[PDB]
Amino acid sequence: SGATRIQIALKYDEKNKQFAILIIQLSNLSALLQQQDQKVNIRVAVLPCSESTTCLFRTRPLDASDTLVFNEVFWVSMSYPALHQKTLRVDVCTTDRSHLEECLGGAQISLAEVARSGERSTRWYNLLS
C-alpha cells in the first residue's frame, strides 16, 4: 500500500529553554491499519528519559482516516545541550475504552541537529513496524 507517514515540526526556544514538538498529521494511515473505524492517537517520548522532567506525551484520540490531522503541540523543559543527546520517538497507537495502547509502528528522530535560533523544521517521517 505504501509507507505510513507522520508530519512533525520541531523548534527550540532558548529564551525559555524549552523544546516544542508539533504533531501535525498522518498520511496513508490505510497502509498501517488492517481494521477499520479504530481510534488513533500518537505517543511521543523524549529519550533517554531524564527523570527530572516529563518525557512521555500523548495526543488526543481521533477517528481513523487515511489522512488524519492532530495539530497538537507539546513543550518540554530542557537545556539545548541536553536536547542534543535525545532521540524523539513517535508511535501511532490505536486505543479503545480499555485505555490500552496498540502502537503499531512509529519513527525515531535523532535531535542532535535541532537548530538553536528558532526557525522550526517541518519534515515527514516514515513509520516502521
Ligand X SMILES: CCCC(=O)OC[C@H](COP(=O)(O)O[C@@H]1[C@H](O)[C@H](O)[C@@H](OP(=O)(O)O)[C@H](OP(=O)(O)O)[C@H]1O)OC(=O)CCC
Task: Give contact residues for ligand X (rule: CB under 6 A).
Answer: 9, 11, 20, 22, 71, 73, 120
Q: C-beta of 9: minimal distance to ligand X in Å?
A: 5
The count of residues in the chain is: 129
- Residue 32 CA from chain centroid, whole number: 16
C-alpha closest to that of 44 among 62, 23, 29, 61: 23
Cα separation of the two ends of the chain = 14
CB of 33 or CB of 109, closer to ligand X: 109
What cell does 110 get?
535523532
Q: C-beta of 35: minimal distance to ligand X in Å?
A: 28
CB of 56 or CB of 73, closer to ligand X: 73
Q: C-beta of 72: minimal distance to ligand X in Å?
A: 7
CB of 22 or CB of 33, closer to ligand X: 22
